[PDB]
Design a protein around this ligand. Structure first.
Ligand code: NAG
Ligand code: NAG
Ligand code: MAN
Ligand code: MAN
Ligand code: MAN
Ligand code: MAN
Ligand code: MAN
Ligand code: MAN
Ligand code: MAN
Ligand code: MAN
Ligand code: MAN
Ligand code: MAN
Ligand code: MAN
Ligand code: MAN
Ligand code: MAN
Ligand code: MAN
Ligand code: MAN
Ligand code: CU
Length: 248
């Protein structure tokens, strides 16, 4: 259980949606993260994998601003509270908004996977991507590909928690969506998958007992785009400056 407090984009700190705070305000601010109803720091379950809640989390509605980024930039996600409590994989996706992300229909988004890290070693439980996040003060770093075509995209970052995933409907997904506007010179526009088609409750990386050894793990969802590393070098770094979500 947790949520993202902020993202840091080449040293530039942006406030994220805070579902434990903003819904208690009369006039919450416009931020880069989607509005969502995880006030309990909770999860989407496999029984909602074919429901809109899996796309950007519970009842999510569009962020009303966006963070402008350069293709090749890295983005750091900051989870709270410290420490993230569960074993599981970590994955990131982009979807072209074919227009402003502030107004895109989330059910139309076609997501392509730009990273994914799963079981790094061992078993029962073994070492996972989430352990790397925990070690890096609850952060994860994703690189925006150098050659991504300029455009507006939703960045969908997600932790999957597998501690209870031996039972049907046991896996816990924690998607968090952000609006970015990408500038660059490249033309890469990869083929994507609808949010409600990414995952199925019987997938071998969703219905799985991690408390066994030896253990192998197939990360759920589509392949990482050819040519991209499945992760860039992880490691936390401080912000040097602060920005606000840019409104259209
Ligand atoms: C999400 O929306 C539905 C429909 O309005 C509502 O009944 C539900 O309580 C909302 N979920 C949360 C956790 O607020
Ligand atoms: C670790 O992350 C939390 C959440 O951003 C923050 O309160 C804390 O100061 C961070 N630790 C350091 C050493 O910055
Ligand atoms: C510190 O370094 C990290 C690692 O790439 C960035 O994501 C962050 O925005 C800051 O530059
Ligand atoms: C491109 O590839 C993806 C699979 O990653 C499909 O979902 C899409 O329809 C197209 O074939
Ligand atoms: C995933 O499921 C949703 C329904 O919630 C559809 O809109 C979508 O096209 C896909 O089948
Ligand atoms: C797990 O297996 C079921 C078959 O009963 C599939 O429908 C699902 O897509 C997943 O592969
Ligand atoms: C639990 O399951 C793993 C496979 O997931 C086996 O390799 C192990 O021997 C144990 O039966
Ligand atoms: C889990 O435990 C088994 C026990 O044989 C190991 O072989 C495996 O490599 C993992 O550590
Ligand atoms: C992941 O990679 C495979 C093979 O390169 C593609 O078929 C898929 O669409 C995705 O880009
Ligand atoms: C996947 O596809 C891209 C383009 O062909 C290659 O760059 C990569 O090495 C892998 O074949
Ligand atoms: C992403 O996944 C690839 C292939 O599974 C690993 O080789 C890489 O180190 C990273 O974990
Ligand atoms: C991306 O990050 C993972 C997790 O640290 C590494 O295992 C991988 O080699 C790459 O650095
Ligand atoms: C990752 O951790 C470092 C401390 O190692 C912080 O400076 C950074 O803000 C992030 O929390
Ligand atoms: C904080 O400060 C550093 C150095 O001036 C920048 O690289 C970063 O983008 C932010 O302005
Ligand atoms: C701009 O301001 C934010 C919060 O006001 C800090 O988190 C950041 O380090 C930067 O100084
Ligand atoms: C940019 O605008 C945002 C949204 O009002 C503020 O929260 C931020 O401090 C800066 O004024
Ligand atoms: C939104 O985008 C504007 C540029 O259009 C930036 O100046 C701002 O910092 C935020 O990324
Ligand atoms: Cu939890």
């Amino acid at each position: 259980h947790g949520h993202i407090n902020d993202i840091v984009i080449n040293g530039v700190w942006y406030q994220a949606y805070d579902p434990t705070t903003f819904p208690y305000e009369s006039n919450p601010p416009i931020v880069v993260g989607w509005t969502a109803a995880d006030l309990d720091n909770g999860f989407v379950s496999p029984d909602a994998y074919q429901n809109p809640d899996i796309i950007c989390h519970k009842n999510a509605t569009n962020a009303k601003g966006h963070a402008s980024v350069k293709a090749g930039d890295t983005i750091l996600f900051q989870w709270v509270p410290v420490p993230w409590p569960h074993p599981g994989p970590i994955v990131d996706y982009l979807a072209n908004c074919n227009g402003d992300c502030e107004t895109v229909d989330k059910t139309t988004l076609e997501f392509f996977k730009i990273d994914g890290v799963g079981l790094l070693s061992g078993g029962d439980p073994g070492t996972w991507a989430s352990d790397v996040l925990i070690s890096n003060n609850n952060t994860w770093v994703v690189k925006i590909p150098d050659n991504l075509a300029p455009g507006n995209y939703v960045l969908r970052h997600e932790i999957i928690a597998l501690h209870s995933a031996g039972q049907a409907n046991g896996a816990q997904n924690y998607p968090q969506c952000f609006n970015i506007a990408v500038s660059g010179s490249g033309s890469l526009q990869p083929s994507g998958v609808l949010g409600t088609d990414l995952y199925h409750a019987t997938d071998p990386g969703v219905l799985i007992n991690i408390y066994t050894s030896p253990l192998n793990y197939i990360i759920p969802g589509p392949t990482v785009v050819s040519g991209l590393p499945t992760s860039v070098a992880q490691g936390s770094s401080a912000a040097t400056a602060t920005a606000s979500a840019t409104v259209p």
